[PDB]
Amino acid sequence: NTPKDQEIKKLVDQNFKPLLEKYDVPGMAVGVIQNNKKYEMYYGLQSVQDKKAVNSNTIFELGSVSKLFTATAGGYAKNKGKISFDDTPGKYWKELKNTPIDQVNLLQLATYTSGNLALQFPDEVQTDQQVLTFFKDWKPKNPIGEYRQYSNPSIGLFGKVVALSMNKPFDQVLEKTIFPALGLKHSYVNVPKTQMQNYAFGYNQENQPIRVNPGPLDAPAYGVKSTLPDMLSFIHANLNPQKYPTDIQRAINETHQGRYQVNTMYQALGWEEFSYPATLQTLLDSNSEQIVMKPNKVTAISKEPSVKMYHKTGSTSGFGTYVVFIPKENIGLVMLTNKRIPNEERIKAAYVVLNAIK
Numbered sequence: 001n002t003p004k005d006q007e008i009k010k011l012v013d014q015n016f017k018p019l020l021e022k023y024d025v026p027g028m029a030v031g032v033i034q035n036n037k038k039y040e041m042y043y044g045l046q047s048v049q050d051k052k053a054v055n056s057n058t059i060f061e062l063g064s065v066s067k068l069f070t071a072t073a074g075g076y077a078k079n080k081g082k083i084s085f086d087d088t089p090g091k092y093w094k095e096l097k098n099t100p101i102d103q104v105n106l107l108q109l110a111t112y113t114s115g116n117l118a119l120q121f122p123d124e125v126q127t128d129q130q131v132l133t134f135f136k137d138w139k140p141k142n143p144i145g146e147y148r149q150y151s152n153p154s155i156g157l158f159g160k161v162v163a164l165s166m167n168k169p170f171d172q173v174l175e176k177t178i179f180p181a182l183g184l185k186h187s188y189v190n191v192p193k194t195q196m197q198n199y200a201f202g203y204n205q206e207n208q209p210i211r212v213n214p215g216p217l218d219a220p221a222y223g224v225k226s227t228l229p230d231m232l233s234f235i236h237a238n239l240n241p242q243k244y245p246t247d248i249q250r251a252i253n254e255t256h257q258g259r260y261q262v263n264t265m266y267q268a269l270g271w272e273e274f275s276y277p278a279t280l281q282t283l284l285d286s287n288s289e290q291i292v293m294k295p296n297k298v299t300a301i302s303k304e305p306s307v308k309m310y311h312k313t314g315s316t317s318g319f320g321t322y323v324v325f326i327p328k329e330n331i332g333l334v335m336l337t338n339k340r341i342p343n344e345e346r347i348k349a350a351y352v353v354l355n356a357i358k
């Protein structure tokens with residue numbers, strides 16, 4: 001005879017709250033959506049030195065969960081006929097016409113299969129001129145389309161091309177088109193002066209306050225900041241795309257389509273996809289050092305499951321993110337922290353909570 005809000009709170013207290021003491025995490029926001037009912041749980045401090053509590057207004061760095069907004073933007077551009085995933089970047093970024101990188105298509109950039117792009121740009125690459133020079137000087141290594149290497153430059157270039165195709169800088173594509181289409185009110189590429197009071201400090205592994213550094217093509221790769229209420233609205237859109245206008249509806253569905261497999265992990269656009277029900281170990285394997293940090297030969301999808309679940313981890317120097325949703329159970333979860341904790345702890349906490357809820 002316990003209300004649903006209190007049962008979810010108890011499960012999140014049991015599974016997420018102990019991670020704050022264990023990893024010395026100053027602040028955490030955990031959100032659950034089930035049957036279009038949203039539950040918001042806030043713990044600890046957005047700023048230790050200011051003694052400001054995490055709340056519904058607190059802005060967190062999403063890190064690589066930013067890639068889900070880049071993927072959604074690409075899906076929007078494709079379904080409006082602004083790009084094809086069979087196009088090469090040279091069609092939109094003319095200075096890349098007839099260069100080796102112009103042999104790589106947009107889908108291969110978005111899904112990390114160029115065959116010669118690492119996690120990060122070289123440290124020296126900062127300016128737009130330096131980014132252009134990097135891609136002009138790029139040469140293939142592995143056969144194009146065959147090897148997955150998780151890469152910021154790779155989806156970064158996809159983002160930049162999607163932006164060129166819509167005649168707007170990438171920050172404006174998200175802030176003026178995609179965020180408003182998804183009904184997000186407190187989501188930013190650039191947090192304005194009037195919201196800096198709501199922008200959490202991140203905390204590094206010595207619990208020193210830090211925020212993300214500017215970097216080359218940072219926005220499309222890891223540059224989005226958001227609140228728990230906005231991230232629950234984003235999960236709602238992914239659970240119920242039919243309720244949104246055609247353009248963003250088709251954009252969202254585009255991001256759910258598996259493109260290839262690496263064992264039990266299906267690479268969608270931004271999202272990782274699994275046959276549901278998934279075992280905990282399947283979800284843990286998706287974020288192993290081998291999958292995240294090294295190249296892996298991809299396979300064609302040979303078993304398309306009827307029922308799928310989707311997740312994505314995100315990290316910056318000072319922030320950890322995890323988002324997961326299961327269409328069949330009409331349920332999802334968001335975790336935001338202002339200190340990185342191991343990916344495996346995020347995945348396991350979410351797994352226990354989502355499997356225990358009635």
Ligand SMILES: *[B@]([O])([C]N1[C]=C(C2=[C][C]=[C]C(C([O])=O)=[C]2)N=N1)OP([O])([O])=O
Nearest residue numbers: 063064065152222292313314315316317
């Ligand atoms: B994204 O967030 C890709 N990603 C992670 C990072 C990162 C992680 C930890 C520290 C630092 C640093 O100190 O700046 C950066 N940069 N890009 O995805 P994952 O790692 O898969 O969740």
